[PDB]
Amino acid sequence: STGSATTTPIDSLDDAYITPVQIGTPAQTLNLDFDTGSSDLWVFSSETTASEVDGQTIYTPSKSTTAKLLSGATWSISYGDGSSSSGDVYTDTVSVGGLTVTGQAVESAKKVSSSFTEDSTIDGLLGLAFSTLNTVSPTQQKTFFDNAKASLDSPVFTADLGYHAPGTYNFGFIDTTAYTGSITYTAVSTKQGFWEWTSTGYAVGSGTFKSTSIDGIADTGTTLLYLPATVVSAYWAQVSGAKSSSSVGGYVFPCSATLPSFTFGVGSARIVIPGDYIDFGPISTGSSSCFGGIQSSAGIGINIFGDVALKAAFVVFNGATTPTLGFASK
């Protein structure tokens, strides 16, 4: 089997991407944030505290004839940005772009933190990291990808995120028309439950490539590119007037600037992030100071190749017995 679904930016900045997911019988379609940095499929639901729902589409398991309460099971997750959610668990039928899994754990939120409430466009998350990170207790549950894997034509999924435009998540096959040149594969460590790999270095604009190992995670659920302070300093030094602002909480730059590209290494290959991808717009409405799309990972504890980086590439998440990651230009 295979599946293919379009993923759409939630706003004009590409803060995140939503992909439609069918849950239950008859289908209830929710727009979920596919997140390769976590491993829970959770949704706003009829069980979510009413004051914490503001415009989201909810899953109502009582209206699904295939829903079954997973007895005694609960979940609770906290994300890098300090947001959180928690609740109970059902199993139900879940389909993405024509690919169907029966008995998928669907984690129904009883509580969500303010940032989720305040974002009416995201109805939940679909985790695509490794199932070892799944928070369901007392019996850990598998991700949608892990459940589908054996049925897929090939044990892979691909992320092709757009810049200010729709893109595609494919399951079970590699669309060879979706990228240029070849896919370069690189080793993955699953020891922390993430798609963790090591970039071979970077360049800023037309500058020379610096060969240096940068360990980090391929994370579709993080907006920005988080890298070591030395690297980030080298980037923003090429932008007149750019500076790290303590009050804003990162590097900002004059909105009148033309940003340089940023290149990252994948083995001997090179992925080029155009400068425009690094512009995240005014820090506040009407401001002429703009927020940067490359920020320091210092104090996160890990480097994160988020959407800013991933959207510059066609990315293969290879779930073979020994997982690997593939990158191609596009």
Contact call for residues 47 and 199 (beta carbons, < 8 A):
no
Catalytic residue among 33, 35, 146, 160: 35
Contact call for residues 235 and 228 (beta carbons, < 8 A):
no
| Nearest distance, CB of residue 245 and ligand 5HL, angstroms | 8
199 among known catalytic residues: yes
**Shorter beta-carbon distance to ligand 5HL: residue 13 or 234:** 13
Residue 136 CB-density burial (10 A; 0-12 exposed, 13-18 middle, 19+ buried): buried
Q: Residue 314: CB partners within 8 Å, gap ≥ 6?
A: 158, 159, 160, 178, 179, 183, 327, 328, 329, 330
Among 226, 280, 314, 317, which residue interacts with ligand 5HL (rule: CB under 6 A)?
280
**Shorter beta-carbon distance to ligand 5HL: residue 167 or 250:** 250
d(CA 125, CA 154): 24
**Shorter beta-carbon distance to ligand 5HL: residue 130 or 277:** 277
d(CA 293, CA 307): 9
**Shorter beta-carbon distance to ligand 5HL: residue 34 or 253:** 253
**Shorter beta-carbon distance to ligand 5HL: residue 131 or 289:** 289
* 291 contributes a contact to ligand 5HL by CB under 6 A: yes
**Shorter beta-carbon distance to ligand 5HL: residue 75 or 291:** 291
Reading phi first (left if > 0) and then psi (alpha if -120 to 50, else beta), residue 72 is in left
| Nearest distance, CB of residue 293 and ligand 5HL, angstroms | 7
Binding footprint of ligand 5HL, residue count (CB under 6 A): 10
Alpha helices in the chain (DSSP H): 114-117, 144-148, 229-236, 307-310
Among 158, 184, 223, 296, which residue interacts with ligand 5HL (rule: CB under 6 A)?
223
* 181 contributes a contact to ligand 5HL by CB under 6 A: no
Contact call for residues 303 and 219 (beta carbons, < 8 A):
no
| Nearest distance, CB of residue 21 and ligand 5HL, angstroms | 24
Residue 108 CB-density burial (10 A; 0-12 exposed, 13-18 middle, 19+ buried): buried
Q: Residue 44: CB partners within 8 Å, gap ≥ 6?
A: 30, 53, 56, 57, 58, 59, 109, 112, 116, 123, 124
| Nearest distance, CB of residue 226 and ligand 5HL, angstroms | 11
Give backbone dihedrals phi and psi of 241, rounded to 5 degrees, phi first: 90, -5
* 161 contributes a contact to ligand 5HL by CB under 6 A: no
Binding residues among 228-267 for ligand 5HL as defined by CB under 6 A: 248-250
d(CA 179, CA 315): 9
Reading phi first (left if > 0) and then psi (alpha if -120 to 50, else beta), residue 260 is in beta
* 283 contributes a contact to ligand 5HL by CB under 6 A: yes
Q: Residue 13: CB partners within 8 Å, gap ≥ 6?
A: 280, 281
Catalytic residue among 45, 199, 261, 296: 199
* 80 contributes a contact to ligand 5HL by CB under 6 A: no
**Shorter beta-carbon distance to ligand 5HL: residue 203 or 283:** 283
Binding residues among 5-34 for ligand 5HL as defined by CB under 6 A: 15
Select from 145-153, 207-215, 276-284, 314-322 the region that touches ligand 5HL (CB under 6 A): 276-284
* 103 contributes a contact to ligand 5HL by CB under 6 A: no
* 281 contributes a contact to ligand 5HL by CB under 6 A: yes
The 10 Å Cβ neighbour count of residue 40 is 25
**Which residue numbers are catalytic?**
35, 199
Applying CB under 6 A, which residues contact ligand 5HL?
Answer: 15, 223-224, 248-250, 280-281, 283, 291
